[PDB]
Amino acid sequence: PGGRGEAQRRKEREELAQQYEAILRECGHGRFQWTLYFVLGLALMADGVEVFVVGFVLPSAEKDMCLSDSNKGMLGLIVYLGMMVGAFLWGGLADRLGRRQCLLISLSVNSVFAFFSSFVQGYGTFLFCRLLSGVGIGGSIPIVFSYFSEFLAQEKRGEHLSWLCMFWMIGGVYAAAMAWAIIPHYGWSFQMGSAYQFHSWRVFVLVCAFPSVFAIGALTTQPESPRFFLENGKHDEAWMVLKQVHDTNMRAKGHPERVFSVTHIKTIHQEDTWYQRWGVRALSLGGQVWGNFLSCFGPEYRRITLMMMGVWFTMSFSYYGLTVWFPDMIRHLQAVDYASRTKVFPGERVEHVTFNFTLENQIHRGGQYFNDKFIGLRLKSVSFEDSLFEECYFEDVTSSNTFFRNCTFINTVFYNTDLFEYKFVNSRLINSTFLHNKEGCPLDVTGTGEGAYMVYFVSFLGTLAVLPGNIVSALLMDKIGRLRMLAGSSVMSCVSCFFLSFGNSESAMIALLCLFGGVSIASWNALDVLTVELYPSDKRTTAFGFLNALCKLAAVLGISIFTSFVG
Amino acid sequence: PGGRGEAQRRKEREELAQQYEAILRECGHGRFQWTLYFVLGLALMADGVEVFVVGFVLPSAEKDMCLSDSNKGMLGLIVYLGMMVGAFLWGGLADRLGRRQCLLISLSVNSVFAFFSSFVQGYGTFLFCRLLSGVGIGGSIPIVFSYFSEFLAQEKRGEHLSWLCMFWMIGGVYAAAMAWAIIPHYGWSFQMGSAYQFHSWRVFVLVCAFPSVFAIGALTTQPESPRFFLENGKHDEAWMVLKQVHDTNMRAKGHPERVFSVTHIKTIHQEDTWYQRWGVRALSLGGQVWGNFLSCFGPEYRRITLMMMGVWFTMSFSYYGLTVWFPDMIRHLQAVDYASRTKVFPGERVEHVTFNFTLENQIHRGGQYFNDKFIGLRLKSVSFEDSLFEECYFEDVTSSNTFFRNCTFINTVFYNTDLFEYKFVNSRLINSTFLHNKEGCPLDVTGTGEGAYMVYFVSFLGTLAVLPGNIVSALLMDKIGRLRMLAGSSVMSCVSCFFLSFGNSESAMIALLCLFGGVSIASWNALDVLTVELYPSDKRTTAFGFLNALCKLAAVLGISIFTSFVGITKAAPILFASAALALGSSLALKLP
């Protein structure tokens, strides 16, 4: 009777899909689909902000706490682990919790946790709270695509479902713009009663998590998804959901909702201790999720599932590329760009002369002063090494970005300077008198901020230029159909000649990565939209959960093996 | 009655339009259509070269034939006003005198005055030569679009009119290639005339006129648009041009002899003193154009023209960014980089060693020189201030970009210099007098030649890189739904505002403007195709030229804004453009 029961269930699912599609067609206009797409764009941009921050801003924002390289570099992989664990668990639980409730709690749990993280201290506390943010955010993509694909009709599924890349990219660009803006400017941190001179990235995390509360406020009015109610077999709630979504067309032009209600009731008739209790229903939910995973792994969907597993594995290369790989190349390019401006000062002092010209970006090697005396000299990016000064009574010498290594001074007095005894490392404290001097601070991220904002701008412009490469590619894989291969080959050949001829600069790499990012993101949307079409809605949310989980595992393991493969 | 007569006339117009498109679909597609495509692509190459020389090669005004800066700003504006006048007048003429006649006259005038501009010397003469060249070139785009639309039907109109952006952009590519290859390297610019000097600037201007004269040479063979021949009653010529295009198409596909009689039957329905002559011609043509313009605002086409002006206003803010905003920002960034890059030395003092070395970018303040016999001195972009020199005279020394102030020369005399009293002001001098020089008409040879080389090479690479991105975007625009090309254009305008408000670095600007300009130039022609389709042939070129002229009006007033108040007002036009695009939300989609 097992085979007959399975065949009967398959027939039930087929007739349920047909009926669903019937309600989809009887709805009428798809402007409510536009509304849902715009609303869920906020969740998309929140996920984009999260992936942007973890890919780019996290390694450098930690310098206020001076974590080790094996701490800050690996922190990205811990946060990726957090989001993939969230993906596993909550994609699995999406088919049972309630997609609207699940999405709302997913947004809120990361939003409030980032709200708390933006002010707290602690070396491992930041890692823990970013794990919390990642486990909150990693489930956004599967939930959002399932939730939006339920509402959208079968015919208009392709275009209006694959146009979701726009909000993700706008979120990435907006997060990049905030990173460029807030990080270098210290006017946003004005406060009273708080002596902590923390860097602006504490405010940056808050302002980048703000789109999460945007999304929460957007979704607090949207109703629940009806097809989940149909899967549960519930009748009345899906009836109000469909009546509400049909009220949009009722306002538009007016439709016979009573007749549609008759079809809805017809298909309803066709489709017939607190702590202890937490574990009591948790074990049942986990067992049902395990059974769902075993069923989706069965002979019905084994070949297809493994086929995509291979497809994402060969596609995940572009994913970790565009998320984390080229950052090293672009930071190296920015470093060699910055190296062309700095200069070495071997000592330009002259006998019995007064020096007052402003000087910046100095690294000293052998620049000793022979009984010199200067007043009002401006020094920026101070780096003294084997450049001892004798009888240099400096007054009103405003200075910033002061760091020392292997240096000494004799009868040297500094006033109104940023010099501090904490920064003195591997040097002898000779004549290190800073009485009545301006209060110095440890450098921490101060020596990286100049490289921080400019790389934020280069990332911002890269993600901005990905969008024009996204539009044409999305139309390419939206409209052409079966023969997209010739257009794709033309695109790659043209962009190859593009950077080949255009390689007589340093923006050639920027253009190359922008074009490749556009192509890869369009392909990602194409894979998402085709996977939506293939899997049935009964097990689709858990599907996407496992798919995103495997994608993130592959993305992590890429760099995890590259760091020990080539170096 | 009048209403009955007008209704009958409109019905006859529609029936003849249907017969015309049926006869066009008789002809088919073949070698003739693409040969005409290349012939008109020569004209669009000329138009693109003219636009490049207007926009990217503004700085040559201050580099050759030095004049006051008050007269230097008109170079980028008077030519645009000339393009206004040309679009207006020559669209109005092309709808009455014939597109081929007016296009030929446009390209003839452009070629003649572009050739004139190179050899002339005076600044006013150059200004009028360039103004006339702009007037001649302004009649290219609308007249060529109409003249090439009257040879195609709806079967392949969209693609084969979209592919003109390739030629429009390759014109700028070729112009930039000349700018980079000729302007910096004086070797190619032959100094054959001992009594006739030759700057690379005039040679570059002269050689940029090759596409115009080549369009003239290769376009006189192409016959006129048969639609005008049908309109004015010249039926035999229409029949023979249709026969010729038919014969050309059959050799590629289909037997020719069968359709001859069918085409003849299809086309046989329509058959059968200087002062005084010029006065009569003016009286007829001006009255006809005035009547056409007043009828274009009538109820038959009032709403469509009113929406189309706004739709074009949406386009003008991207044309601006591609054409005039990018070169100005590149030049200003290079200027501030040059200002940042300075070298200060107390003095080049060496012991008994000849100073025969090439050095540049010398700016010395408060430098005292030890007296010695100076030999081999060379001055290139060298300036002095607060410095004194004693016994430092040299014979036959080259000078360039030399400006001296608040510095005195003691017993120092230089020869073969390009210095005048208007540069050396507010300073003392003892036993110093510069003679045996080339004083006269200022000629800044190699003036910022290294800076000019970078600018021209960057413009060349930006255009050459836009070219394949333009290929891709033009190919992919066809797949877009023809009702949503307008929305795509609006999206590209919005991202144009994004780039323009978020562009502040050299390589950043180059990459972002190239990647944008690909798709933007691809999406520009959507408005052209839209205006071609919904404007009737008797009203096509007049209205199209009017709308193009309003586009040039928006561009020239943006230029006026940047010439009157810029620096603090970098982002004000961006906000204005964003608001203008947002305002036309419904009009950009409402297509009757």
Author numbering:
A (entry chain B): 133 to 404, 415 to 709
B (entry chain C): 133 to 404, 415 to 734
The authors write:
2D classification revealed that SV2A protein existed in both monomeric and dimeric states, in the absence of any ligand (apo). However, we could not reconstruct the monomeric map due to relatively weak signals; instead, we determined the dimeric structure at 3.5 Å resolution (dubbed as SV2AApo), with C1 symmetry. Intriguingly, no obvious opening is available on either the cytosol or the lumen side of SV2AApo TMD, indicating an occluded state captured for the SV2AApo structure. Roughly related by a two-fold pseudosymmetry, the two protomers of the dimeric SV2AApo are superimposed with a Cα root mean square deviation (RMSD) of 0.9 Å. However, they are not identical, in particular the TMDs, which show significant variation. For one protomer, the typical MFS-fold 12-transmembrane helices were built into the EM density of higher resolution, referred to as the canonical form (C-form). In contrast, only 11 TMs could be modeled for the other protomer, due to the lack of TM12 density. Furthermore, the peripheral TM9 swung away from the TMD core, instead of packing against TMs 7, 10, and 12 as seen in the C-form, to engage with the neighboring TM8 of the C-form protomer. We defined the configuration of this unusual protomer as a non-canonical variant (NC-form). The dimeric interface was mainly formed between TMs 8 and 10, with additional contribution from TM9 of the NC-form protomer.
Synaptic vesicle glycoprotein 2A (SV2A) represents a novel antiepileptic targeted by the prescribed levetiracetam (LEV, Keppra®) and brivaracetam (BRV, BRIVIACT®). SV2 proteins are critical to neuromodulation and neurotransmission, and a well-established role of SV2 is as a crucial regulator of synaptotagmin trafficking. SV2A protein is predicted to share structural similarity with the major facilitator superfamily (MFS) transporters; however, it is not classified into any existing solute carrier (SLC) family. The overall SV2A architecture can be divided into three parts: the intracellular helical domain (IHD), the transmembrane domain (TMD), and the glycosylated luminal quadrilateral β-helix domain (LBD).
